[PDB]
From Swiss-Prot:
It comes from Homo sapiens. The AF-2 (activation function-2) motif is required for recruiting coregulators containing LXXLL motifs such as NCOA1 and NCOA2. Keywords: Activator, Biological rhythms, Developmental protein, Disease variant, DNA-binding, Metal-binding, Nucleus, Receptor, Transcription, Transcription regulation, Zinc, Zinc-finger. Coiled coil: none annotated. The gene is RORC. Changing residue 114 to Q: Completely abolishes transcriptional activity. This is Nuclear receptor ROR-gamma. One of its GO terms (biological process) is cellular response to sterol. GO terms for molecular function: DNA-binding transcription factor activity; DNA-binding transcription factor activity, RNA polymerase II-specific; DNA-binding transcription repressor activity, RNA polymerase II-specific; ligand-modulated transcription factor activity; nuclear receptor activity; oxysterol binding; RNA polymerase II cis-regulatory region sequence-specific DNA binding; sequence-specific double-stranded DNA binding. Changing residue 133 to N: Nearly abolishes transcriptional activity. It is found in: Nucleus.
Amino acid sequence: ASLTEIEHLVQSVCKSYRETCQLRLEDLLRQRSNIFSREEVTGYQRKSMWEMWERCAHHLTEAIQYVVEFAKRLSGFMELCQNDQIVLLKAGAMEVVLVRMCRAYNADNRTVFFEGKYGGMELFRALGCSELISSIFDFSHSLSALHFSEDEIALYTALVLINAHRPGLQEKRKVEQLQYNLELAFHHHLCKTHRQSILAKLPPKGKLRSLCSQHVERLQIFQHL
Ligand SMILES: O=S(=O)(c1ccccc1)N(CC(F)(F)F)c1ccc(C(O)(C(F)(F)F)C(F)(F)F)cc1
């Protein structure tokens, strides 16, 4: 009920990202020149699928390991029952990772940050599902064509978690309110930055779900972590 407490929420959510920026954007941009040479690439291609999926599920579990803190520094988040605190992240934290990967994306050369270097999707010929791989590349490519800002990722990823239509919740009405205040806080900073035009350039609500869902099956056929 105050412009201060609304901006305070905006300023808060952006602070949670700055620490849970798993990667340093400065390093990401400064290392965008250091690229897996075709010799160094060819090493990854030999590995059987059972290797990369582990390496992938390792970094992903490590990447999620920074989403878990981020979720907990949000206003009123611990004021939920553990039921309505586990139901959220299991469905939500996965989609947050796919977002933060846009930071690690260089749409100039269509490359992504993998184990200290940048590499294309031929770095993943071993897995055997390039269509899913490419769809992730073009998805992150659909957020480089928006030139996202740090506080735009922090404010959108935060509204990926805070969904009240997640089944299994119990304190539902208690989640809607916290989602209301994040919708308005999101639109507000968009207005006061003249970036509200992207509200339609967004990938839909259903694209994010059908992406990692279509993948996490395959990650679970192998590692299941
Ligand atoms: O950003 S990643 O480098 C990545 C590379 C290629 C395709 C997707 C994502 N990495 C996140 C981290 F920074 F931790 F490395 C990541 C790797 C792989 C995944 C996958 O879960 C998979 F398939 F390998 F298991 C997938 F992208 F497919 F979902 C997710 C995130």
